[PDB]
């Protein structure tokens, strides 16, 4: 079990750790978060009391270093930093725990939610989407745009998701215009899976990471990316049976975890009705359809 200590909490903030969150009051004696399960990526995120604008946060993996949070009063945010001196770090963490100034990552033992939302997410791939290679952790916020969004303006602060575009020469083979547009198996299987992602786990990994950035930050490009990667599968007549079965599991837990009241901005009616009811795979997502219909029948 790992620890992210906080230097202090000088400003009132809502703190998120994966799918959990709690309120810290201005100058409350708060020194961080403990018992963080090793073995998964994690995300620690922030929404200030004063400015509910700009949710922001850090993707990280405790196996890749000792990380702490420290408010910067110049830049005005909770910043993730790495402590290289490891003895200093252990000693700082031990004191805070002895004084019990840390909240405990509150995992129920029956609960595989986080593992199910992050099964294919790998920190090394997050770092290729979010380019800032001097840190081992990755900052995201509400307003970052995607590489594809900049094509339609600062490239250093972009989300480098995989560009998916159904009306592109990459998606459409000359002479198979109708065939490739109405059945995207070539684009999915040859172009994207075999060519760009190499395997279905890397693809699912980006798709999961896009969904999490959309939920936790309201990042609109991330939402577009999630829906696009779903639609590309759902609009392919030929998809390996194992991929459909995992896709169905993946979506199910995303739909289960979404805030009930955010459903109107993170879920695209057109994509979902198409995927569940008109597409090649309309019969293939039994778990996802059943949860969608019982929880968000308005959308359909």
């Amino acid at each position: 079990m790992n620890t992210v200590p906080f230097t202090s909490a000088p400003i009132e903030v809502t703190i998120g750790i994966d799918q959990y969150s709690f309120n810290v009051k201005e100058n409350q004696p708060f020194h961080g978060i403990k018992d963080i399960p090793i073995g998964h990526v994690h995300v620690i995120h922030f929404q200030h009391a004063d400015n509910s604008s700009m949710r922001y946060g850090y993707w990280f993996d405790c196996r890749m270093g000792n990380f702490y949070i420290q408010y910067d009063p110049k830049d005005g945010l909770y910043k993730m930093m790495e402590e290289r001196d490891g003895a200093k770090f252990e000693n700082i963490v031990h004191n805070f725990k002895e004084r019990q100034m840390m909240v405990s990552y509150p995992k129920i033992d029956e609960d595989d939610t986080w593992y199910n939302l992050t099964e294919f997410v790998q920190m090394d791939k997050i770092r290729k989407i979010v380019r800032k290679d001097e840190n081992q952790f990755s900052y995201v916020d509400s307003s970052m745009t995607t590489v594809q969004e900049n094509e339609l303006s600062d490239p250093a602060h972009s989300l480098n998701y995989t560009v998916i575009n159904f009306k592109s020469r990459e998606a459409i083979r000359p002479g198979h215009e109708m065939e490739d547009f109405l059945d995207k198996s070539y684009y999915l299987n040859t172009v994207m899976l075999q060519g760009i992602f190499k395997n279905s786990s890397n693809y699912f990994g980006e798709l999961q990471f896009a969904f999490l950035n959309a939920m936790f930050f309201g990042n609109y490009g991330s939402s577009l990316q999630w829906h696009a990667m779903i639609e590309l599968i759902c609009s392919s007549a030929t998809v390996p049976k194992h991929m459909l079965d995992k896709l169905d599991e993946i979506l199910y837990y995303q739909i289960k975890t979404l805030p009930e009241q955010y459903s109107d901005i993170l879920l695209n009616e057109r994509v979902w009705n198409i995927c569940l009811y008109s597409s090649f795979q309309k019969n293939s997502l039994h778990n996802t359809e059943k949860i969608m219909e019982n929880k968000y029948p308005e959308l359909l």
Binding site: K167, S168, R169, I172, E177, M178, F181
Partner: protein, 237 residues
Amino acid sequence: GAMNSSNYAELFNNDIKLFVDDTNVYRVTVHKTFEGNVATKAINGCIFTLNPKTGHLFLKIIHTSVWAGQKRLSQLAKWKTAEEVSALVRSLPKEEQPKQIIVTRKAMLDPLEVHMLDFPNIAIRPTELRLPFSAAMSIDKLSDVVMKATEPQMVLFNIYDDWLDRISSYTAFSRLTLLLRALKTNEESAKMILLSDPTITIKSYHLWPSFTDEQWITIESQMRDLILTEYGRKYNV
């Protein structure tokens, strides 16, 4: 964006554009089978591609052999149309391709966009006008060449005959849409009007009769009467 009443005069500027109508690409007769079921028999069709400024009609005939063994023919007709329009642009010198192509039905937008991905500088647009181009198979000589075709074929017409020698493109387009609107609303009467005077002939190389200016104004007035009338007979007014 879309083409409507407000930007109607863009059709006659000097940017080369076409109208593409696909409403007569896939045509069928519907008949009873011996078993008393229903079956369709396809008949030849055409793509109506029209340069509105010069009157050039690039009439692509769609021979029934192109549907043989194909499923979902209404959908393939859209893609077939896009494929042929694309082939025509590509056949053409750069300075001769369309800067825009306006499709008369929105279902054509995606097929044509996808077929024209190689021409990112050609704009593909819908329109909010209810243009009467489906009535082009009521022009006897067009219908004849389509029905006689034994193979895929492209025939080039000027749907304005020699009218641009005397009137502008704006006016020629408006005459054409009025004639076609009339043919669509009541083809018999429309055609009675155009051929009532055996002294006014259609030259062998034209589609419409050789009317003088004064004779066109009367014809044009009679066609508006027809269109107003059929509107009553239809709605009781």
